[PDB]
Design a protein around this ligand. Structure first.
Ligand SMILES: [Ca+2]
Ligand SMILES: [Ca+2]
Ligand SMILES: [Ca+2]
Lengths: 67, 156, 105
């Protein structure tokens, strides 16, 4: 019985629990491309993060070696 | 960026080292010591489209004055003529990692030595001796990020 | 010097010739590592019973709200790292010829 939970799990009812099956067949796809594009952004945001750990590890050496 | 200019001087066609040697004997028509000084450089700069300052005149000669005489002789003149005929610091950083295989932040010898053997060319023992100390300008045994830049300035 | 300064340049020019190759292929072991992990994570769809098909779109609808939240908390680490690099980088930062031959010959 949480206010933010009852409303969060209610965005499904208003978005799917209301109409057609051929709207559904052409909506569950659009609801899946949105995920592949969102797990691609997450992939590149991971490879970019690994790379920054190196730039900082190198920069952390330069600020010291040049002291 | 220096020892990149002696590589153009080393590979000048002798058909070019005639035109420059000729244009040098004219350059010095009037000099006592037979070499380009501030007087002869004043002439061919303003009589080419400038009017440089005599304190700035000596700053174009002292850049190739590997003799400290204030005069640009012939061998100092080709080094002047190759400075007037590279690679970005952002691009040399993504390449700096492919050297750093252990991903520490340096390039010890065994990481340079392996990049050299991958070039397909025939490598010697003396090549890796001069090269390692062309970058390791403090003899710590590795080429940190700043050194790897002054190392590869202008390397196409 | 133990070797000519034009071989020293020939060798320098040859190291960077494969470092871009060793990078153009590192960006290909990564182009695939994406698509491979983009079929383990986002396994392609395949079709259902008009009603018990709806309990899938609602699972996809909340899958997104979970994915884009996973994508945020990693973005705010990439974002906070970009802020630190410039904060790091600023610290360490603080520590003619052809016209002559024509007019002489
Ligand atoms: Ca001199
Ligand atoms: Ca290393
Ligand atoms: Ca060093």
């Amino acid at each position: 019985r949480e206010k933010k939970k009852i409303l969060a799990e209610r965005r499904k009812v208003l978005a799917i629990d209301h109409l057609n099956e051929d709207q559904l067949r052409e909506k569950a796809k659009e609801l899946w491309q949105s995920i592949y594009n969102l797990e691609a952004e997450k992939f590149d945001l991971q490879e970019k993060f690994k790379q920054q750990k190196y730039e900082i590890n190198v920069l952390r050496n330069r600020i010291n070696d040049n002291q | 960026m220096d020892d990149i200019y002696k590589a153009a001087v080393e590979q000048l066609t002798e058909e070019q080292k005639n035109e420059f040697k000729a244009a040098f004997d004219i350059f010095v028509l009037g000099a006592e010591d037979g070499s380009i000084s501030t007087k002869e450089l004043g002439k061919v700069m303003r009589m080419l489209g400038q009017n440089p300052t005599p304190e700035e005149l000596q700053e174009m000669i002292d850049e190739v004055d590997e003799d400290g005489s204030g005069t640009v002789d012939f061998d100092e003149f080709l080094v002047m003529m190759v400075r007037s005929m590279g690679k970005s610091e952002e691009e040399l950083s993504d390449l700096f990692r492919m050297f750093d295989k252990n991903a520490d932040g340096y390039i010890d010898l065994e990481e340079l030595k392996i990049m050299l053997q991958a070039t397909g060319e025939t490598i010697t023992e003396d090549d890796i001796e001069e090269l390692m100390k062309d970058g390791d300008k403090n003899n710590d045994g590795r080429i940190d990020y700043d050194e790897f830049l002054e190392f590869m300035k202008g390397v196409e | 010097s133990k070797i000519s300064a034009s071989r020293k340049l020939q060798l320098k020019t040859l190291l960077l010739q494969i470092a871009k190759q060793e990078l153009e292929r590192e960006a290909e072991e990564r182009r695939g590592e994406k698509g491979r992990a983009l079929s383990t994570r986002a396994q392609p769809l395949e079709l259902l019973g008009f009603a018990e098909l709806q309990d899938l779109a609602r699972q996809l609808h909340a899958r997104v709200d979970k994915v884009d939240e996973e994508r945020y908390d990693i973005e705010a680490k990439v974002t906070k790292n970009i802020t630190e690099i410039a904060d790091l980088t600023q610290k360490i930062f603080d520590l003619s010829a052809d016209a002559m031959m024509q007019a002489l010959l």
